[PDB]
């Protein structure tokens, strides 16, 4: 029933406690508690198996045009092997999914989107490719079979450096390159992550997947990490979790992701939902995504947020205890008046009202490697 | 939100009455009644848009091995450019989806699956490719962007001959070829269908899709046909509608599809679900799919089937009036001792029993073009 990734056995052999996630079998954690796995990631580096995520290639001389007809970013402006976080929007301005798209030098776009949205996402693009060809233009879509690994943390680069002949110091955040990793040729190394720390993601061919993970794991700096730690790290980093912090009813502006909207796109008005989105850039927003902090009982998704008079003003979309801060962190939507960092709010926790404070994101300073 | 084929506007412009079908927006019928469209199809020919079905390619030298591990047919025995209907079965012998597999001379298997199952099937094959690649085998999957048109009827061949250089008399039932149809190159023409009549199916590159459709439609012999007509045409031909007549709870034996089991594989008991299927082939089976005919109001899906003793013995999976026979036809499951043609049964229709007779399928003799 549950789909397996090329590292299935690998997890079972390393104390991986499998669970159902987006129809896949993945380790929620391993031998060490997730809080320890978390802290370990922010001090050394951990290995994440994110092979369940959809990896696609947009081929054709008109690839950029196809992608920009679906996303909000300035894709054309992207330099070779340069990538960015972006969003798929609908005519209403909502978000269909968040993704990372890279303008590779192999004449193709390297797109990576959420595993829980692959059916939605693949149909969306497949349909656009057609619609585009129906208008006489060169474009193609192709799904990758490659496995996907994520090495994240301060010592992550050093570790991978041992198995690559390239100067990782020349691979800045959000750029990638095809290189042979630990013997496995044809790998895609992208300086990106979902942890807030420095790190990379290796798109490796299935045949070499286990070899790569084993090689990487041979280093004493590396420790495997499961879903649980993946989620607590990304929240501290203030990264969105599609389906929770954002969805088809939250616009890029309401979701505090305005920076993803390209400058030219803003001026062109050529992206789905632009009629709605652009006007909001002018403060015309009824709500906004913010970070919350509190003590004691942890704030959970779906919990109401009230002002200090106890009037409901919003809802929590994600929350869990922060290992790096020894407090509870969360994301939610509140009116603009209450989005200023330091704002005092109340959150219904475990049925009771709990005092919380709006925190600037990321809750923990990021360590992205930049030149 | 419904997905649209490359022929969406073409349908609207020709009077298509759009409806929701398997998540797509397709015409249920056009200007002419589904009844007249039906008959027109059996006397001349009709054009159907089936671009919503999943068209995939299995690449690699291990394609036959990958496929055989997923389907029941003898794939290795297929001569070049020869195709066959086949089934996807789980270890329990359940049918996951039915499809048509062609062993093209271009080094790849050409597969076509139901639109309503593209998520399931694609995942199924993708996962197998992954598993096989991790075993050093050379194999790959690829989804086609092509649209898919079906011209069915006694005059379809003639109508199409005017747009191709090749003698279609050389393209027997269940065989295909890559040829230039009405100016569009790269089209794969296949002598197959879902109507019981002679016919072809064209896999045409989207850019020429609308051109090919109008090109064909220009002939006075041709007339567009919608969903209702497609349903009544296949039912008369005794063909299964996955989801209705067969599903994951029906084996190829219970489904009266024993013939789809490859000749060699059947005798060797070497195919998915064999441990459940073989005993059934031998006789240890509880229910069989059959055809039923009656007068008055048409028998519909989910309607109870009973013997003359007021004992419920089965259910109707599909059903509708037959334009060609001016009677009501349907498919349903009944215990084996009640499956002999000529057997009288009672079927609940509009909250009232009606006398019905078990009929051998197809209800209307087919006219495939074979040598
Ligand atoms: C989870 N996720 C994800 C992931 O982890 N990795 C890849 N390669 N692709 C994807 N694709 C889909 C999805 C989108 N998730 C993400 C992924 C990355 C970020 C992120 O690093 N954002 C940065 C901005 C980076 C930038 O400048 O583009 C930030 O600190 O705000 C924010 C959200
Ligand atoms: C609906 N459907 C379909 C379709 O119409 N066309 C294609 N190309 N591919 C597919 N793939 C999935 C699905 C399966 N539907 C079908 C399609 C065709 C048949 C059919 O003509 N069967 C013949 C046997 C043909 C054979 O010998 O292989 C018969 O008379 O029973 C029976 C069922």
How many residues are given for chain A?
371
> Left, alpha or beta for A60 (phi > 0: left; psi -120 to 50: alpha)?
left
- Running DSSP on this structure, what letter comes out for residue A338? G
Which letter, b or e, does each residue of A341-352 get, where b requires 16 or more Cβ atoms within 10 Å of its Cβ? eebebbbbbeee
**Residue A231 DSSP one-character state:** H
Q: What is the largest CA-CA distance in chain A?
A: 62
> Does residue A33 belong to any structural domain of this protein?
yes
Q: Are A73 and A260 in contact (CB under 8 A)?
A: yes
Under an 8 A CB cutoff, do A209 and B133 touch? Answer: no
Domain for residue B370, yes or no?
Answer: no
Q: Are strands A327-334 and A344-349 parallel, antiparallel or unpaired?
A: unpaired
Q: Which residue's CA lies nearest to atom 13 of ligand 2?
A: B99
Q: Do residues A342 and A208 share a domain?
A: no
The CB of A184 under 6 Å from ligand 1? The reply is no
Among A114, A143, A172, the domain-final residue is A143
A369, part of any domain: no
Strand partners, A349: A352
Phi, psi torsion values for B168, nearest 5 degrees: -70, -10
- Strand residues in chain A grouped as ranges (E): 18-21, 24-27, 45-49, 54-59, 82-89, 95-103, 109-113, 140-143, 147-152, 176-181, 184-190, 199-204, 222-224, 288-294, 304-306, 312-322, 327-334, 344-349, 352-359
Report how far residue A294's alpha carbon sits from residue B101's, in angstroms, rounded to the nearest whole number. 60
Q: Are residues A85 and A38 in the same domain?
A: no
d(CA B254, CA B277): 9
Domain containing A45 equals 1-52+144-237
Which value, in Å, is the radius of gyration of the alpha carbons in chain B? 21
Asked whether residue B368 is assigned to any structural domain, the reply reads no
Cβ atoms within 10 A of the Cβ of A260, count?
A: 19
Nearest-angstrom CA–CA distance, B27 and A31: 56
Domain shared by A96 and A221, yes or no:
no
Nearest residue to B316 via CA among B241, B366, B251, B226: B241
Q: Which residues in chain B have Cβ-Cβ distances shorter than 8 Å to A145?
A: 126, 129-130, 133, 140-141
Q: At B264, which CATH number?
A: 4.10.1250.10
**Any idea what the CATH number is for the domain that residue B347 is in?**
2.40.30.110
Q: Supply angle C-alpha A166, A50, A7, rounded to 5.
A: 90
The residue count of chain B comes to: 371
Decide if B367 touches A, using CB distance below 8 A. Answer: no
Residue B142: which of A3, A142, A210 has the nearest Cβ?
A142
Q: Of the candidates A341, A342, A343, which has an alpha carbon nearest to the alpha carbon of residue A306?
A: A343
Confirm if A323 and A39 have CB atoms less than 8 A apart. yes
**Interatomic CA distance for residues A102 and A104, integer angstroms:** 6
Q: Are B192 and B203 in contact (CB under 8 A)?
A: no
The secondary structure of chain A in percent helix, strand, coil, rounded to multiples of 5, reads 25, 35, 45
| CB B255 within 8 Å of CB B287 | no
Regarding whether B334 and B200 lie in a shared domain, the answer is no
Residue A274, classed as helix, strand or coil, is helix
- Our CA-based measurement puts residue A330 at a distance from the nearest CA of chain B, in whole angstroms, of 32
- Single residue among A204, A237, A270 that ends a domain in this structure: A237
Whether residues B225 and B153 share a domain: the answer is yes
Give the resolution in Å.
2.6
Chain centroid, CA B270 distance in Å = 25
Cβ-defined contact of B126 to A141 (cutoff 8 Å)? no
Cα(B353)–Cα(B309) distance, integer angstroms:
12
Number of structural domains found in chain B:
4
- Token look-up 């794969």 returns B188
* β-sheet bridge partners, residue B304: B315
* A127 shares its domain with A64: yes
Q: How far apart are CA A359 and CA B214, in angstroms?
A: 61
The residues, ordered by sequence, that sit 6+ positions from A23 with a Cβ below 8 Å of its Cβ are A2, A3
Shared domain check, B182 and B233: yes
Which residues, including other chains, have CB under 8 Å from residue B319's CB and lie 6 or more apart? B235, B292, B298, B299, B300, B301, B303, B328, B329, B330, B331, B332
Angstrom distance (rounded) from CA A352 to CA A343: 20
CB A167 within 8 A of CB A177: no
Q: Taking the mean position of all CA atoms in its chain, how far away is CA B198?
A: 14
Q: Which of B170, B190, B171, B188 is nearest to B179 (CA)?
A: B188
Place of tokens 């009037």: A311
Q: Within a domain: residue B34?
A: yes
| A312: phi then psi, degrees, rounded to nearest 5 | -60, 135
In this complex, is the C-beta atom of A134 within 8 Å of any C-beta atom belonging to chain B?
yes
Say whether A174 sits in a helix, a strand or coil. Answer: coil
Last residue of a domain, one of A251, A283, A315: A283
Indicate if A298 and A332 belong to the same structural domain.
Answer: yes
Cross-chain Cβ contact B205/A133 below 8 Å:
yes
Quick check: CB of B113 below 6 Å from ligand 2?
yes
Q: What is the CA radius of gyration of chain A?
A: 21
CATH of the domain at B218: 3.30.1360.120
Q: Is the CB of A114 under 6 A from ligand 1?
A: yes
| B77 assigned ligand-binding residue | no
Calculate the CA dihedral of residues B34, B39, B45, B47 and round it to 10 degrees.
10
What 3 state SS string does chain B have? Answer: CCECCCCHHHHHHCCCCEEEECCEEEECCCCCCHHHHHHHHHHCEEEEECCCCEEEEEECCCHHHHHHCCECCCCCCCCCCEEEEEEEECCCCCEEEEEEEEECCCCCEEEEECHHHHHHHHHHHHHHHHHHHCCCCCCEEEECCCEEEEEECCCHHHHHHCCCCCCHHHCCCCEEEEEEECCEEEEEEECCCCCCCCEEEEEECHHHHHHHHHHHHCCCCEEECCHHHHHHHHHHCCCCCECCCECCCCCCCCCCCHHHCCHHHHHHCCCCCHHHHHHHHCCCCCEEEEEEEECCCCCCCCCEEECCCCCEEEEEEEEEEECCCCEEEEEEEEEHHHCCCCCEEEEECCCCEEEEEEECCCCCCCCCCCC
| Nearest-angstrom CA–CA distance, B314 and B294 | 16
Q: Would A367 be classed as within a structural domain? A: no
Structural domain includes residue B159: yes
CATH number of domain containing A65: 3.30.70.1400
At residue B121, what are phi and psi to the nearest 5 degrees?
A: -55, -50
DSSP A343-361: -EEEEEETTEEEEEEEE-S
**Who's near B69: CB < 8 A, 6+ residues apart?**
B128, B272
Q: What gap in Å lies between CA A261 and CA A265, rounded to an integer?
A: 7
Atom of ligand 1 at shortest range from CA of A148: 8
CA angle A20, A24, A25 (to 5 degrees): 65
Domain co-membership, B102 together with B206: no
The answer to whether the Cβ–Cβ distance between A134 and B205 falls below 8 Å is: no
Looking at ligand 1, which residue's alpha carbon is closest to its atom 32? A239
Q: What are phi and psi of B148, to 5 degrees?
A: -140, 120
Q: Are residues B163 and B132 both part of a single domain?
A: no
Q: Which atom of ligand 1 is nearest to the CA of A86?
A: 28
Q: Which atom of ligand 1 is nearest to the CA of A362?
A: 30
Residues A155 and A100 in one domain: no
Residue among A224, A203, A20, A228 nearest A112 (CA): A203
Residue B241, CB-side half-sphere exposure with 13 Å CA sphere: 21
- Dihedral Cα B346, B347, B350, B352, nearest 10 deg: 20
Residues A231, A123, single domain; the answer is no
Q: Does A337 touch chain B (CB under 8 A)?
A: no
What experimental approach yielded this model?
X-ray
Going by C-alpha positions, the residue among B348, B342, B350, B330 that lies closest to residue B289 is: B330
**Residue A261 carries which DSSP code?**
S
In a domain, B300, yes or no: yes
Residue appearing with tokens 């219904």: A348
A22 lines ligand 1 (CB under 6 A): no
């Amino acid at each position: 029933v549950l789909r397996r990734t090329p590292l299935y056995d690998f997890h079972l052999a390393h104390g991986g406690k499998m669970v159902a996630f987006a129809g896949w079998s993945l380790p929620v954690q391993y031998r060490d508690s997730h809080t320890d796995s978390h802290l370990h990631t922010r001090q050394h580096c951990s290995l994440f198996d994110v092979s369940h995520m959809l990896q696609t290639k947009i081929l054709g001389s008109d690839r950029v045009k196809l992608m920009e007809s679906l996303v909000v970013g300035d894709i054309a402006e992207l330099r070779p092997n340069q990538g960015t976080l972006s969003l798929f929007t609908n005519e209403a301005g909502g978000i269909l999914d968040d993704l990372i798209v890279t303008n590779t030098s192999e004449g193709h776009l390297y797109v990576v989107s959420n595993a829980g949205c692959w059916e939605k996402d693949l149909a969306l693009m497949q349909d656009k490719v057609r619609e585009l060809q129906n208008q006489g233009r060169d474009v193609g879509l192709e799904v990758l079979d490659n496995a996907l690994l994520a090495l994240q943390g301060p010592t992550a680069a050093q570790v991978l450096q041992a198995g690559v002949a390239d100067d990782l110091r020349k691979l800045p955040f959000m750029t990638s390159a095809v290189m042979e990793v630990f013997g496995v040729s044809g790998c895609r190394v992208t300086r990106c992550g979902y942890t807030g720390e420095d790190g990379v993601e290796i798109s490796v061919p299935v045949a070499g997947a286990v070899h790569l993970a084993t090689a990487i794991l041979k280093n004493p700096e590396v420790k495997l990490a499961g879903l649980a730690a993946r989620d607590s790290l990304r929240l501290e980093a203030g990264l969105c979790l599609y389906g929770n912090d954002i969805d088809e009813h939250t616009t890029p502006v309401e979701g505090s992701l305005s920076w993803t909207l390209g400058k030219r796109r803003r001026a062109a008005m050529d992206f789905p939902g632009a009629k709605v989105i652009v006007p909001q850039l002018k403060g015309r927003v009824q709500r906004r995504r913010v970070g919350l902090m509190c003590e004691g009982a942890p704030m959970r998704a779906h919990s109401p947020i009230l002002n200090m008079e106890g009037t409901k003003i919003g809802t929590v979309t994600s929350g869990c205890p922060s290992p790096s801060l020894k407090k509870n962190v969360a994301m939610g939507y509140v009116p603009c008046e209450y989005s200023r960092p330091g704002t005092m709010l109340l959150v219904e926790v475990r049925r009771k009202q709990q005092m919380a404070v709006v925190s600037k994101m990321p809750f923990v300073p990021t360590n992205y490697y930049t030149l």
